[PDB]
Amino acid sequence: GRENLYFQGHMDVLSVAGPFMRRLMLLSGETVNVAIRNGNEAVLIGQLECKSMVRMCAPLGSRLPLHASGAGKALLYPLAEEELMSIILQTGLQQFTPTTLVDMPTLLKDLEQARELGYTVDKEEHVVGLNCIASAIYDDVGSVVAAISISGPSSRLTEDRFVSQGELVRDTARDISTALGLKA
Known part of the structure; x- marks a missing residue:
């Protein structure tokens, strides 16, 4: 079912996300990605690149x-923490950069903060020089x-912009969730 990469629910998110991805790319100036959970990894299924020659551009x-x-x-x-515990038991917490979160307590602390704010921030935890700001899409x-995210060079998507961009990503996710809920 939803564990299939081509699951219709995933495609439904893509079908309504277009307009919002466009607005987010324009307002943030960075590449916008849409990911879903599959095989205990986040897989990029939608993307709208920003126009800058230097940017994030991993393939779908x-x-x-x-x-x-x-x-x-x-x-x-x-x-829920129990599902998180299940996932990590199987994936482990591979370190990708010097600041990756590789301990369950720090990870949980970080996710609790994202749940309070409605967006998460990845500051060079995956790829050195890449910041990612993302928010959950709900049914x-x-x-x-x-999840929808903006991803770009750490020198451009700077810390002083995390709050303004985080709120824009959260609002964007919120609108996609709403559009997804419409029966057209």
């Missing part, structure tokens, strides 16, 4: 770590079905 289908990428963490923060029952 790229598989990202759930505990170390912004997109991955956005798929994790809505989950009619409040379950997380996907």
